[PDB]
Every structure is written in structure tokens, then in C-alpha cells.
Amino acid sequence: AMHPRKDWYELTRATNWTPSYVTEEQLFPERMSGHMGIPLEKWESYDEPYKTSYPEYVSIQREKDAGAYSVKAALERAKIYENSDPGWISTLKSHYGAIAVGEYAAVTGEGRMARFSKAPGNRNMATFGMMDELRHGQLQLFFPHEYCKKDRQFDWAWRAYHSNEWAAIAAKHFFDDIITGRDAISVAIMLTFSFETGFTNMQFLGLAADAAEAGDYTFANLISSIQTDESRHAQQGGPALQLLIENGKREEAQKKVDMAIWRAWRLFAVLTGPVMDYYTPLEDRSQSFKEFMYEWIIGQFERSLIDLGLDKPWYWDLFLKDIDELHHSYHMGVWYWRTTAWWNPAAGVTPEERDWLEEKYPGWNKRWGRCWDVITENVLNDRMDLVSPETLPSVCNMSQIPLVGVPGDDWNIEVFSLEHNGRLYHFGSEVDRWVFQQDPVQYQNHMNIVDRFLAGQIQPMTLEGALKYMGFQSIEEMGKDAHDFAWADKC
Amino acid sequence: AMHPRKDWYELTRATNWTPSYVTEEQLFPERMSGHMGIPLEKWESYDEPYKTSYPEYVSIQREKDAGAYSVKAALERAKIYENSDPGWISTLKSHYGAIAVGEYAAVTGEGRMARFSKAPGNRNMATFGMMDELRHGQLQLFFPHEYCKKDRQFDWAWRAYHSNEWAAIAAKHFFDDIITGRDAISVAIMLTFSFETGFTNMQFLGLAADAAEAGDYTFANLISSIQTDESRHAQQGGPALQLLIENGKREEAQKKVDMAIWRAWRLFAVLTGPVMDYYTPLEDRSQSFKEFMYEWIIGQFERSLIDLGLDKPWYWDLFLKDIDELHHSYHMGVWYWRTTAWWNPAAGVTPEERDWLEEKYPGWNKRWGRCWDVITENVLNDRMDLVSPETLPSVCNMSQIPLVGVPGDDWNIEVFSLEHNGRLYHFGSEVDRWVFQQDPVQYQNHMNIVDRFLAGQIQPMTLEGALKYMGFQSIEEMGKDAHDFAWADKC
Amino acid sequence: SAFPVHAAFEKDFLVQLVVVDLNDSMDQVAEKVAYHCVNRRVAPREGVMRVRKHRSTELFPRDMTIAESGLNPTEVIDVVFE
Amino acid sequence: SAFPVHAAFEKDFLVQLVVVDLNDSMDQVAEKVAYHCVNRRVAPREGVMRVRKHRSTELFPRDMTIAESGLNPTEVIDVVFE
Amino acid sequence: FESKKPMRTWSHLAEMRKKPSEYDIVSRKLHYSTNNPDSPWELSPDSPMNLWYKQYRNASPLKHDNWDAFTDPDQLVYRTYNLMQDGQESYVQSLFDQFNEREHDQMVREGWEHTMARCYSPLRYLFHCLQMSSAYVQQMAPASTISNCCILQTADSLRWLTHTAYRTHELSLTYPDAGLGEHERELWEKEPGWQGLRELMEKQLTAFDWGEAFVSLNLVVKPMIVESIFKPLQQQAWENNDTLLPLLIDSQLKDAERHSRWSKALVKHALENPDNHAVIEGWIEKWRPLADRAAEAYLSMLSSD
Amino acid sequence: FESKKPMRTWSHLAEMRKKPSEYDIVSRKLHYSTNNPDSPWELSPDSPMNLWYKQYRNASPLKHDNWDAFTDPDQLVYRTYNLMQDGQESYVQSLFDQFNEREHDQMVREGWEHTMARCYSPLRYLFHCLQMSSAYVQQMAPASTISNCCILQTADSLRWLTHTAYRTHELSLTYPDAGLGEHERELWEKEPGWQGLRELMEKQLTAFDWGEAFVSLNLVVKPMIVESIFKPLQQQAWENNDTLLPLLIDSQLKDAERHSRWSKALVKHALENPDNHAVIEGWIEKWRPLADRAAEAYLSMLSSD
Amino acid sequence: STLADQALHNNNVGPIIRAGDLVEPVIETAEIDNPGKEITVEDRRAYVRIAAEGELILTRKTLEEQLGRPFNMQELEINLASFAGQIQADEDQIRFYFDKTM
Amino acid sequence: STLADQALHNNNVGPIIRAGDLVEPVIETAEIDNPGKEITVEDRRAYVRIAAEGELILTRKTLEEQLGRPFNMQELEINLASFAGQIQADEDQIRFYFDKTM
Numbered sequence A, B: 001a002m003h004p005r006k007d008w009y010e011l012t013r014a015t016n017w018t019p020s021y022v023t024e025e026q027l028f029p030e031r032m033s034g035h036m037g038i039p040l041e042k043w044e045s046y047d048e049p050y051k052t053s054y055p056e057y058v059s060i061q062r063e064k065d066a067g068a069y070s071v072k073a074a075l076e077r078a079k080i081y082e083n084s085d086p087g088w089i090s091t092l093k094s095h096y097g098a099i100a101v102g103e104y105a106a107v108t109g110e111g112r113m114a115r116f117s118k119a120p121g122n123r124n125m126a127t128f129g130m131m132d133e134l135r136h137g138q139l140q141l142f143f144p145h146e147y148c149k150k151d152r153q154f155d156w157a158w159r160a161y162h163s164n165e166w167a168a169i170a171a172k173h174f175f176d177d178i179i180t181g182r183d184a185i186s187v188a189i190m191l192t193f194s195f196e197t198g199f200t201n202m203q204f205l206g207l208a209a210d211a212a213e214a215g216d217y218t219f220a221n222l223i224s225s226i227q228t229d230e231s232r233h234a235q236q237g238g239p240a241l242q243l244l245i246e247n248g249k250r251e252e253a254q255k256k257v258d259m260a261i262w263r264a265w266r267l268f269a270v271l272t273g274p275v276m277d278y279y280t281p282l283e284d285r286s287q288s289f290k291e292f293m294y295e296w297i298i299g300q301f302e303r304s305l306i307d308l309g310l311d312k313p314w315y316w317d318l319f320l321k322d323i324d325e326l327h328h329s330y331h332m333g334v335w336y337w338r339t340t341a342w343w344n345p346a347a348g349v350t351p352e353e354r355d356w357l358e359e360k361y362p363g364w365n366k367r368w369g370r371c372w373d374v375i376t377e378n379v380l381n382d383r384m385d386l387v388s389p390e391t392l393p394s395v396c397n398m399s400q401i402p403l404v405g406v407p408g409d410d411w412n413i414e415v416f417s418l419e420h421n422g423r424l425y426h427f428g429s430e431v432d433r434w435v436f437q438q439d440p441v442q443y444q445n446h447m448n449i450v451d452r453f454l455a456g457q458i459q460p461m462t463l464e465g466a467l468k469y470m471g472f473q474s475i476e477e478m479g480k481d482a483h484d485f486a487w488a489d490k491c
Numbered sequence C, D: 001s002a003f004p005v006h007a008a009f010e011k012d013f014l015v016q017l018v019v020v021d022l023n024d025s026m027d028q029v030a031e032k033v034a035y036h037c038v039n040r041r042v043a044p045r046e047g048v049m050r051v052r053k054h055r056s057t058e059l060f061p062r063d064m065t066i067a068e069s070g071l072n073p074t075e076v077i078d079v080v081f082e
Numbered sequence E, F: 001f002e003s004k005k006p007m008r009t010w011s012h013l014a015e016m017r018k019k020p021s022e023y024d025i026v027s028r029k030l031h032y033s034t035n036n037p038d039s040p041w042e043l044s045p046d047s048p049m050n051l052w053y054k055q056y057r058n059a060s061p062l063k064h065d066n067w068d069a070f071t072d073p074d075q076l077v078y079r080t081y082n083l084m085q086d087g088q089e090s091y092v093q094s095l096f097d098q099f100n101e102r103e104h105d106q107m108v109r110e111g112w113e114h115t116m117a118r119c120y121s122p123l124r125y126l127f128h129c130l131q132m133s134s135a136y137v138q139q140m141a142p143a144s145t146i147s148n149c150c151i152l153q154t155a156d157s158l159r160w161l162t163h164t165a166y167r168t169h170e171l172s173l174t175y176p177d178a179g180l181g182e183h184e185r186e187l188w189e190k191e192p193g194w195q196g197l198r199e200l201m202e203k204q205l206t207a208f209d210w211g212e213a214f215v216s217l218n219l220v221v222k223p224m225i226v227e228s229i230f231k232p233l234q235q236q237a238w239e240n241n242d243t244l245l246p247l248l249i250d251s252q253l254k255d256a257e258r259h260s261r262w263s264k265a266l267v268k269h270a271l272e273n274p275d276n277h278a279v280i281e282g283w284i285e286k287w288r289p290l291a292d293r294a295a296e297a298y299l300s301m302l303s304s305d
Numbered sequence G, H: 001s002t003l004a005d006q007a008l009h010n011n012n013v014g015p016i017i018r019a020g021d022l023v024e025p026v027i028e029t030a031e032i033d034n035p036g037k038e039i040t041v042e043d044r045r046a047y048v049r050i051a052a053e054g055e056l057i058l059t060r061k062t063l064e065e066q067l068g069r070p071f072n073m074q075e076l077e078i079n080l081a082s083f084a085g086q087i088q089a090d091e092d093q094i095r096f097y098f099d100k101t102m
């Protein structure tokens, strides 16, 4: 007979002990552990709500992979690469480039907890977490690898995080801040709670919905399978949050969540935003970016944060306004500077798309529409020189993304600047400036790509020079309009 | 360490012994065994060329099913049922009705060998064969079951073999003749060699090619997985054939193959012929029915039959002529009498299709096209009474399929009849009459559906009476034109 | 009285069961078969329809009845044009 | 000599790096920013382009040079119309 | 004709109180050969196989008007059977590997290789007889749910045969002078200890009535093998420091208990018809003596040395 | 810039002489944190974690120009690790089930439960230390191929922990008066026989240089555990009629040998730089005495009553 | 804003099941095991959002019956892509729930 | 007929591989393991017909190398939907072949 897990589970996490040959602080140094002075004994009350055990994990994960790979195999001849809209193909290129090696980096966030968390249950669940992120990194390299032979941009599934390309710097600056660059408890709160119950549902499930509409079941099935792991290991965050609150650290916990959510938001708005409202073909847009945000971030995540005892962030209303406006400008920036991307941005401004944008964001045409009007007229006149840039955008010193605002009929743009230790920094929001001020030692001597350009690190100081510095190896790899401007024919 | 199969395989089939408490003939009665008086010791040289062992079987078959089911699960929302051409849906309905419970009957063919073959290797391979056919019957019930709630015709995946519907009688008269109704050696030669290396490749791989073109990967993936089992268990046939030849029974072996191939051909022409050349949308026709015949039956199967030391069938030239002609008329019969089918036949005669038919079968328009001209004119003129029958087709006493010929400009039709023991029988070819004459005890007291109608077994003796006799339980279940005659608009 | 035959009509694609009467002339039999064929799958044409035993060279006289013909129930006939 | 600024042009969607000269007048500075905005993402219009520190209420005189203005390199300016 | 809506499941299951399971959907009411008493198969009603089925299935004294309602208590389908057996068989294969690494066969008590060669390796004949016999019950049983249990039982018999072949060969590597893998047919044919078993199986294999086949095989022969062969072999292995055999036999006994479970459920179904008690009891008493003699002769041989 | 054709595989693998494997594609050159010596992570170059990596990874005395070229000799990826371990773990769980059915624990020699409570159950602490330590080498190693071996080793360490938790609980059902599941922390903290191991692990867990961490964990501590804990337990289990523990440990030893296999491969890769011989040897000499003392104290405790 | 306020002030709890063979059995189980709760379902094709007010229970026994094959509660992880509410899981059931009422 | 005799008179042997992860590796393996045979490939989307004249060998070792993961010869059954020629199989390779020459 076999004995049920409930009867022996406690023994698997009865692993704390009182050190005698080194000190507790030597074994769990604050800079790596992040215990905030909460004594060893208090951490033993940590109770992961989504448990598993080694024999079950290997069996269940064997099954999950068998399904993901069989589906890929059975659909290799569905002609997705050949028959898909180029906007959908660019969505795949963006996703795999932005995600695969970042998932692998997440193994280190989990390893940080597995070694340095004082909570025994956290150390075990983080061991499964290390394994889960290994899975995610490997899947999201194996899957796009077949497309290397079709298109050099898919090399970036592997190459991006090794480059200084501007979007890869943005991704790395965020993930190095919340995943690999902080103590174990910060990882539990910023990564597993904030990012992983907060935003990854958007990129993995919201995008899966659009993928299924687009008829790409290999991809939809993959990313939704990945998120089933997340749903388990993300549950390391809540009990850590609850433990900090019970031990007098609510304010610290709140600040970490406020920071992580905002940082996630800005990157999400530049990567997932344009995918959902512009690259995905109109007929495949299951919901708008804003609608998904309201389902996943407002309706689900923010409600769960309140249930666990935290408050709505101090920047709530700013966040809501950003959801209406930011990604429209981020898309415009990515598109106008498309040659610096490793995917081919779709403009997404045919009349029928502009009508959808107007319904989903009333006032769109009198704002972003005004810029797209100028762009469209230049395409129709074959003045293509006027739709490629001859300077660099100014870039946020926190998010690493261009400084933007609302264009057109009620123009409004604001940079939030800061003098600090003899240097002038510029931030794309009040919250980004605040994140800097929360932990200047984390950020102060970092130089963004424009800082580097001005410092003489990028030679020559031209478009070509920037493109070489960003790691492009051939003409094909540089982003172009997804449809070769064929959308202008509908205008 | 483990010891490789080659070193212990012989012991797995060292199972013949000399009976002492009953006679060899009591243990292996000729009526069930079919050993043709070849002594037990001779059968020990039987050497199955495609071997497996129990531990490998369970492991590999576990893997095969995991893939088949995962693929089905991942594509449930691909909108196959909702978006497919209704001709494709009808192909699914015809396939599952004609195949699922027949696969389950094949378990009994395999069982007959597992118990009654004098060759030990045959008895073991047939045990895996029993298992494979169980798999195939279960997969082909499970897969269509989700469509029960969509369409009562999918009930026939289960119901067909329990009915007296005319095509079900044709299927059972064939399968009961070659699978369940003869001795073990006859099964080995007629089922595993003749039918299963000769025709099943057409219905499970030829059709899979069309399914892939149509974008129905759940189905293509399923049936190609099924045929992987066939490729193994079908290899029981060749070594039985080789043994009969070595022991002076080449003449009887040849006769069994010649019979089984013709019987399979006629059923295949009424079921697969119309699917490949009429129901499958033109754009998804990977090859014509004839082209697939020349690939699988002529180029592959017949060449294999010669390699093994048998001769081309005596009716070779009749067979080649039949491939050009027979399924066009069988199609016409199934469509005109569509109300008697459990699927909705597609007419398949829009001008674009008739151009394809002419290219694939030169002279088609001056033959079958003449009938379709009259039918088409009646549909265009709303004379629908003339596109539904008011009598029964005459039916073959062997194949159970209507007696047909070539219509139009060079009309030729021939029935081959026979008086025998006080009854007049009618056959659709010289070969069908020959088959009857090879074994009259198997066939002589069988009554085809028209014989039953004339004898008073079908009451009332009307179209409705016959339809109710055939097992239809509601108005929805009876076949209709697949497109509700929408095709005439293109004419 | 009722007399079943199997009939193949000229230019059609099949043989059908047609019930005629023992006292039908061949002209009447031809018309009963034509009902199930002409304007359904076979174009109408000028000419006189005749009846013969299946694949036979000889034709039955037009006014000859099923009874006089020697035909047995369920035998096959053709209906062709002269 | 080279003098980088970050400039936001009226009705555009972003701030861009624009390198001007230490001794450029505000009129010259406005035209250097306009190069990267007008007829690219911003419709041309009549009127006088003026330069101001980002979101300031006061405009720099048209003939004032970058050197005279007190601006520091990499400070943010707006270019707006009278 | 009436107009009817689509059903949630097959028409024959549509009146179920509970949602049909995978087992119900894929297993139930599949023998169309029971539909027409006069023509089981769609051939001449007096074709040879039609005469065979009319005599040996339809005319069985074991009678029930709804055999199709029989349910495997384990509700196994092909898919779940392979999941279960890949698990059990992976486990057995791993035992073989590890016990081999540890040189298990060298440490058995002196002479055990001869007891194995005499009493164990020729079990391949006995197990193959069970395989052939199970296949016979499969092809004759009057319900697909019954036949399915027999298919899986046929496969299990082959599993046991294969274990035995594998271990016969393996043991012969350590003990090459005991006739292992060489003399099994002669033992099965000539050795007194095997002759009761051989007579039992040759006669059982010629009981062609489906009911008598089922009763003799599953209610008489197979339980005798559990109690008189499998268990005594475990006891002897223990006395002779063979620690692998008891573990292997325990895995085989799981299959055997499963066979007994479905058989018992079939008996319970049959006994709904009170007339069947005497029929079954009659067959049991007919075959019991042969089974008891087979066991006696085997045990007398096993307890030699 | 020039126009180039698509590559068959990733740009960094395109010069391979043969077709990249699944392992090559999903495992190689994934730590971007080794690209910029001044800024491992994309933050302020003197952020705390950048300072941590610059000291404890980049500045290690163990040096190689191309750590990325390291290859797991087993070429394991997540998918194949789970296939392998689901096989090995399903086997162990089947052993637990069957030995429990047979009431194995009741038949061990008198007093064995006390030896288990003292020398076996507190192994959960030692195994968890290996788990924590393996995760540290993962996060610090300068190549993803090295880190991947460490991730799988972290999981194996948890596997061993889980075996021990399960069996401690199971034993306690038969022997409820031995402190099983109750007194392990006390034993780990206070019993002399555990103090050498605990000192060794507390100190090893504070060796933050990646190279020293790797050498001490995989070349000193883990091989000691094989020779001084695993094998002696198997011998003692044999003397005490515990037949399950030796089989369980053989499964764990398969994992332990796998860890030694990749470790030796990493050593061989490191020794391409002649300077590394003295570095590795020095760490071995440094850590050996603690390891020896750990082993000696453990064995004295295992040998007593 | 009122739209954001309204979205936040919900008490919806329950599983988000990814496309596959668990979607319909989970919906049916939610209905059966929470009588007197309305179950809401939002179908996004790649996933389905299944919810009730305050508390939603899925029992292993009911789920096995609706799925139609042997099923252990832990297996739900293969198809549980996300969930709303806090989770209390055990071998007999999973309960999704909130502590607070908004 | 002429077309039919021409179709019958072939000596093509080799595997028919169903759509999936074994198609490209098997084609590559056929080319590598039969040097100086021309390998023909007919792509029917759901399956690919791979052939050579008279004999075609697939070795386990080459197939493992082209597949890029551990591979036992018996696993080919998962994807071998049919084949032309007689089959001679063992743990090291499969040979498809004809006895006669047409």
C-alpha cells in the first residue's frame, strides 16, 4: 500500500536547523536572503498552498511535455510560417526573442530562493520552480529553432539577451532587477507574486487566445502548458507576503509590489501592447490590450492583492490612464524605429483597423491618428526617407524605452527628470523616477543606450553604428514593415 | 544489465508441443485452423519479420495513444466541424460508421489465429494483433463520440454494424467473409496479407493525405497512427504464404489472395472512391482515386505479391478497367439513393470539378456526365421529385452493392447471373460470380437486401418501409445532398 | 399478377428492380422502366422503346406480354431503342 | 561645438535626441528639431516656432543662443508654436 | 418518420442515469454477431462459422438475455491497460536489471537451478496454453465487455510467458549445464509432474462451448495455478534464497487477481438467471478432478530434489 | 552590412561539424551574465548583485577561456531527465508499495528501527543541505551547461530527501516508539555522530566562490557520502534483514554516480588550463579533513547501539 | 474610474482551464459541486474562465465522474492554466475562495 | 495497360513515414546510409514515401544522429505508417529490400 502525501508532507519540509559552526547570518546573509531580520523560527510557518512532491512532479511534467511536443510534431505541415499573416509571424519572433533566455534566467531567481530563503517550504517549491523555468527556457528555444532555416530573425530566440539591442536591454534591465539582481524574499514578492500572478497571464494566456484565433495551435498549446507550471510556482509569493505582513513588514512588502508591478507594466506595454492591438490581424484580436488588462490585471490580480491584505498602489489612477495611452505611443516608436527591432512591426493602421482602434480607444484618430496620417501620406508619395529615422529617441533611465506622450489634437508629453550624484537622469513617468529613488545603488551608474551614444561608446555615431552595436549581423535581421507597406493600398 | 531480445526471442515462440491426450486434429481442427494437413512440425519454420515483445509493446503503444489523444484535445476548438466543407464532414461520418465496429470485429480474426494457428510465432503476433484491433475499435468510437451532440448521423459510428442499412450489409458481408468467418490460415492470407497490405493503406493513408490538405489534423494524425500498427501485424501474412508455397499449397494460397483482393476492391470502390473523387473538396484532393490505386495497390502491393512468389491475379485486366469506371457509377448510385445512407453524399459535379474529372478520367463527361447533365437540369428547374428514387437498385449477390455499368455515349452494362439450387443469383462482375463458385456453402443461402424485399421480409414494401428496416430512427439521420444543392448555382 | 424484373435502360448507369404485370405488353413494360430512368438520369429521345433479355440479340415483339414471353421472375431485361 | 538636447516637438508622440551647436540661436535650434518631426509625424503649419525649457511657462527669446540661455547639455526642451 | 434531436452519447447509452465514461463509450454492445440468432455472421446462415457460433455460443446452456450489460469491475480500456502494465512491466524490467547487476542468480542455494529447469522454465508451455485458451473465450463470448476482459487476459498470459522465456535464458547464463532453454518441451511432454497439467490443458482447449470454456479456464484452471503453482513456487524460492522470483510472481499475481475479479463479476451477472447456478456448478465439478490431479502431480515434482 | 542566407541552427552553433542535437539546441551558451565583465547584470555596475558576481564568479581562481564549451557527458535536457527519472522513481514507488504489502518492516532484526531513527531519518537534513548547495552552484556557475547539471542535481537531492521523509513516516507506522519523524532535528543538532557532517555542510554552504563551491560539494562532500554513508548503510541493512534499503540506495547511487560523471567531465574541461590543477588540488586538500572527520563520526555512530 | 472600480470590486473565484479535455468536465463539476451558485463561463478559445461568487469547489469524485476516466486531483495541474481566488487544495478537492468581500 | 505494367515493374523499397518529427531525420538517414543510391521522396503531407532501388537501409546510429535525441530502432514503429519491400529488422538497423528484380 502507499501512504498519502498529507501524512508525510511535513517531513519533506522539516529542514530548518539552528546553525552552530557558522552564524545564522553567515548561512543566510541578508543581501542574498532578504529576511529583514525575521528570525529563523518565524519562517517555519510558511505554508505553500500549491504543493507537489518529487514522484508526482516527474510523472506529471513528463505528461505535459509529451503533449506539447506531440502537438508540435502533428502540425509541422500546417504551413503556419507560409500562410500566417506576417504580423502573426512577427509576434512569434518578438515573443521567443523576448522570452526564451529570460525564462532560463528565471531559473536563477528560483535558485536564489532554493538556497537563501529561510522558509523550508519555499526552498522546496523553488526547487520545482528551478526545474519549471528550465523547461520553459528549453521549450522556447526548441520550438523556434525549426524556423532558423526560414528566417534569420528567429536566430534572436537565442541571440537577443546576448545583444545590446534596445528592446533586449529593456528586458534585461527589468528581469535583472526583479529576477537575478535581488535577495530571495524580493524574488518571492517581485517575481513570483507580482510579475507571475500579475502580468505573465497576459503574455501567455491572453496571447494564447489570439493565437488560437489565428489558428496557431502549436503555439497556443505550448504557452498555455507553460502557464500551468507558473500557476503552481507563483504560489510561493503569497505566503511570503503574508509572513512579512504578520511580522511587521507590510510597508516593505507593499513597496516591493508597487515597484515590481510598475516595472512589469512598462515592458509589457512595449512588447505585448503592440502585439495585441496592431500585429495580431484584426480578425484574430480576441480582446483589445486594454480589455485583457482589465480582465487579468485589474479584475484578477489587483483583487487578489487586496484579498491578501495589501492596498491598491499609490499610482492607481496614473496606471489606469497609462493603460489608455502608453502602448499606442510605444507601438509608434517601435514601428518608426523598426530597423532597430529583430521582428517586423506591423503598422496596423488600415481604415478597418483604425475604426477598431477608435471603438476600443475613443479619440484615437485625433491623437495617434494624426501622426499615422502624415506617415501614410509619405508612403503614398514614395518619400520613404521620411518614414525612417535620422536620430535616436530619448530613452527612459528606468524602463530603457523611449520617452513618449500623447500626440496630435491634445498633445501632452512629460519627462520626469532627476539630478542625482552629479548626473542628470530622465524618466518616462513619475513612478519610474520613484522606483529609482527607492534604490539608487541598484541603478545609479547604469547607462542607457542614449547615454552610451553620447559617451562615445557607439562608433560611428550614426544609424549604422547603432545597428552594429545592437548586434545585427545581416540586412535581413533588421526590422521592416511586416507587410512591406501593402496596408497603404487600403488607404 | 538487460539481455537483448535476439538472445531470448526464440524461447518466446518455443510453444508447439506434440499432443497426447487429444489428437493434433482435435486440438487444431481444420475448419478453424486451416492447416491444409500440413504437419505441426512444418509450422515451426514460420518467422514473423516484424517482431516485438510484451514490455516493448506496452511502452510503445502507450506513447502512440498519448500523442493521438493529446492532438485531439489540443484541436477541439479548431472549428473542423463548424467550418469544414460538408463533404469533408460526410467523409468523417462514412469513415467512422464503416470502420469502427469492423476494426473491433478484426479482434476476432486475430483471435482466431492466436488460438488456432499451428505456427507459434503467428499465435504470439496475433496476440499483439488482437490488442491492436482493440485499440483501433476504441479510438474510432471515442473520436467521433464528441460529435454525437452535433449530428445524429455520427451515432452511426456505433450503430452502422448493428443495422441492415445496405452499405453496412456490404461491409459486414465482406468482413464476415474474410475476417470472422474463415479458418486461421485463411485469415492470415485474406486479412493480414491481402486486405491489410493491399487496401487499408488507401483508406488510412491516402485518406490521411486528403485530411491533411483539408486541415483536419486530428483525423489525419489518428488514422496514420492506426496504420503504424497495421504495418506490424500485417506482416503475419507473408510468412504464412511462404509456408503454404513451400508445402505445395501455392494454388490454394493464390486463390485465397485473388478472392480477397477482388472482394476488398468492390467495397473500397463504393466507400473510398466517392470520398476521394467527389466528397473531398477539389482543393484537398491530393491525388485522384485512380492515382492512389496505382501508388498503393499496383506499385506497392502487387509488386510485393510478385516478390513473394505469387502471380498477378487472373482478372488483372478486368481490374484495371474497373479502376477507370466502377467508382464513378458507385458514386452516382450512392448519391441518387442518398436517403438510404447515414452520411450526406456530395454530388461533386460543379464545372470546375467536372474539368478535374475529365483530366483524371478522359471521356468522363460523355459518360457519367450525361447522367449528371439530366440531374443538374432538374435541380436548376426545381424538379426535385426526379432527383429522388421511387424504386430499388438491383444488387449484387456477392458485393451487396448495386449492379452498375458505364452510362452515356458508349453505354455498356453487364450482369453475370447464375441458377443454383433453385435460386437465381445476379453478380456485378465475372469475378464476383467466380468468388461465389469458389465456395458456395459460404454464400448460397444468403439473401441480399433486394432478395429480402422481394421475399416479404421488409414491411411495408415501400421506400419508407425499407428505410425503417435499414435502421433509421429519425428524419435527420437519412442522407441528403451535402450542400443542399448549392452546387447547382455554379452550373 | 405482380411480376418483378431487373431492368437496364439504355444509357443509364445501373440495373433497377421494376415491378410489372404478368399481362403487360412489352410496350407497357418499357414505359414502366422508362418512368424510373428517362428525365432522371437519361435524356428523352425520339424512337420506339423495345425490350430484350439482358445482352440478348433478339427483341421481344412489342405486343407480346410478359406471360407469353417465357421470362421468369427476377430475370434481367434491357430496354433499348430500335 | 556639439550640444545635445532632448527635444519634444508640439503634436509629436515622443522626445528625441537632437544635437545642436553651442552658439545656435533658438530659431536655429527649433529648425534642427523640426527636421526630425515636421513632415515625418507632425503636419506642417504656419506660425513661429519657439523654444522653452520642458513644460516651462516662459519662452527663450528667438535670437538667444544656446550658450546664452543657461541650458545644460542633455536638458529637455519643448519646441512649440506662438 | 419522427424528428429527433442529437443525443449526448450513443443511442444505446442515451438513457443512462450517469454520464457515460470512456469505458462505456468504447466497450459496450459491439458484437453485432449476436443480433440475428439464425445468422450470427452476414453470410449463408448455414456457413461453417455460422454453424460453429450457433452451436458453441448461441446454444450454450449458460444463458442470459442481456450478456451485454456485463461490466468489467476494473473498467479497463486499451489506453488504461497499457498505462497500468507499462508501469508494472517497467518495474519488473527494472528488477531484472538490478538483480542481474547484483549477481542474484549466483547466490541461490546449491541445486536451485535444477529445480528451476524442471519446475519453472516449462511454465512457458502452460502459460501459452492460457494465452491460446483466453483467445478462444474472447472470440466466442456473447458480449464485447466480456470479450475485452479476455483480450487483456490473453495479453497478460503472453506477458507471463515472456517473463518466463527471459528468465530461462538469463538463468542459463549462470547455469549452462542444467538444460535451461533446451529441455522444456521434453519435460512438458514426458515428465510425470507436467502430465496432469498437460492433459488438463489439452482437454480444456477442446471445450468449445463458450460457457464451458469460460468456467473451466477462469473458475477452475486459473485459480488452481494461483494456489498450486504460483504460491508454492514463492515458498520454495524463499527456502532457496531466490529473492527475485517471489517479487516477479507477486507482479504476475496482480494480473491473476484481476482475471479472477472480472470472472467473479461475470458469474454474478450469470447468476441473475437462477438456472445458471446448476450449469456452472456442473462444469466446475466436471473439471475439478482434472485440476486437482494436475496440481498434485506438479507439487509432487516441485517438492523433489 | 551584407545580405546573408538563413542558418540551419543558432548562429553560435552554425560552425559545428555535425547536426546540433536537442541538447546542443536547448542548453548551450545561455548565461548572458558572463558577457560583460564589468556588468554581469544589466544594472548599475556596482549594484550589490553585480559586486557579488564579480567577486564570487568572475574572480574565481578556477579559470578557463571557454567554460561554455563544457558538455554534460549524459547530454540530459529537462524532457529526457523526466523520462529517465519517472522510470527510476516509478520503480522505487513500486518497491515501496510491494514491500509494504509484504510487511517488510515487521521482519527487520530486533532494534533496527532504533538504528534507522538515529542514522537514517536525520539524513533528510544532510540531503537538504546538498539540495541548497547544488542550487548555489547552479546560480553561480559560469556556463549554462554547467548550471543545467546543477539544476538536475538539485532535483535529485530533493528526490533523496523525499525518499527519506516517506520511509521515516512509513517506518514509524510499524515502530511508533522510536522517535521516527519526531527527533531528527535534535539528532542533527546534538548527536555527536551528526556533528562532523553538520559542521562540514554549514561551512561548505558558506564557500561562496563558484569554483570552491563546486569542488567542495561535488569532488569532496558527495563522494564521501557515497563511500561513508550510502554503502555502509547498505551493508548494515544486510546484516539486519532490511532488504528494501539496499534497493532504495542502489537507485540513489545511480543519481550519485551521474553527479560524479558530470563533475569529472567539468574537472577534465578545467584542466585544459594547466594552472587549474593546483587550484583544484588545493581546495581538495582544504576540505578533505572536514570530510574525513564527518565520515569517521558518522561511522562510529552507525557501528554502535 | 467607474469602469476600473467596477472591475476591481468583484468576488469571482475559480479555475482558468486551458483548451483541451478538461474544459467541459470542469464546467460540469463546478455546476454540480456548487449547487445554488451561478457558475459563469467566459470562453476565450485557448482558455475558459470559470467562476462563482466567493467560493468555488471542485471535488475529485465529481470531476472523475464528469471526465469519464480515473483521475487524481493533482492531475488538474496539467490543465489548470490560472485561477482566481486563493487556493486550498487536497487529495479530495480544490477550493478557490476569497477572505474578503468587495 | 502500359501505365499499369510500368507501375508494377518497379523495384522501389523504403519507409512511408507519417507526418511528424521523424520525416526529415529519416530522409536524411536514407541519404547518408545509402551512399550512391539515389533516394526519392514523394511528399503527400500526411505521409512521405521514401525510396531507393532494390534496397534501402536505415541504421539506428545514423537515425539517432539526425534525430538529435536517444533513439532505439524499435521506436520507429511510432512513425512507420507503411513500407515498400520486405523488411529485415534488428537492433542495429532496418533493411527494406526485394528478392526479385522487375
Ligand SMILES: O=C(O)c1ccc(Br)cc1
Pocket (backbone or CB within 6 Å): A098, A099, A100, A101, A102, A103, A106, A175, A191, A196, A200, A230
Ligand atoms: O518567471 C517567469 O515565468 C518568467 C520570467 C521571465 C520571462 Br522573459 C518569462 C517568464
Ligand SMILES: O=C(O)c1ccc(Br)cc1
Pocket (backbone or CB within 6 Å): B098, B099, B100, B101, B102, B103, B106, B175, B191, B196, B200, B230
Ligand atoms: O484489419 C484491419 O485493420 C481492419 C479490418 C476491418 C476494418 Br472496417 C478496418 C481495419
Ligand SMILES: O=C(O)c1ccc(Br)cc1
Pocket (backbone or CB within 6 Å): E008, E009, E013, E014, E015, E016, E017, E018, E019, E020, G028
Ligand atoms: O452529465 C451528466 O450527468 C450526464 C450526461 C449524459 C448522460 Br446519457 C447522463 C448524464
Ligand SMILES: O=C(O)c1ccc(Br)cc1
Pocket (backbone or CB within 6 Å): E219, E267, E276, E277, E278, E280, E281, E284
Ligand atoms: O467461482 C467459483 O468457484 C464458482 C462460481 C459459481 C458457482 Br455456481 C460455483 C463456484
Ligand SMILES: O=C(O)c1ccc(Br)cc1
Pocket (backbone or CB within 6 Å): F219, F267, F276, F277, F278, F280, F281, F284
Ligand atoms: O576528484 C578528485 O578526486 C580530483 C579532481 C581533480 C584533481 Br586536480 C584532483 C583530484
Ligand SMILES: O=C(O)c1ccc(Br)cc1
Pocket (backbone or CB within 6 Å): A050, A051, A052, G073, G074, G075, G076, G077, G080, G089, G090, G091, G092, G094
Ligand atoms: O493535494 C494537494 O495538495 C493538491 C491537489 C491538487 C493540486 Br492541482 C495541487 C495540490
Ligand SMILES: O=C(O)c1ccc(Br)cc1
Pocket (backbone or CB within 6 Å): B050, B051, B052, H073, H074, H075, H076, H077, H080, H089, H090, H091, H092, H094
Ligand atoms: O530488432 C528488431 O527485430 C526490430 C527493430 C525495429 C523494428 Br520497427 C522492428 C523490429
Ligand SMILES: [Fe+3]
Pocket (backbone or CB within 6 Å): A103, A106, A132, A133, A136, A226, A230
Ligand atoms: Fe516560466
Ligand SMILES: [Fe+3]
Pocket (backbone or CB within 6 Å): A106, A133, A196, A229, A230, A233
Ligand atoms: Fe515562472
Ligand SMILES: [Fe+3]
Pocket (backbone or CB within 6 Å): B103, B106, B132, B133, B136, B230
Ligand atoms: Fe485495424
Ligand SMILES: [Fe+3]
Pocket (backbone or CB within 6 Å): B106, B133, B196, B229, B230, B233
Ligand atoms: Fe489491422
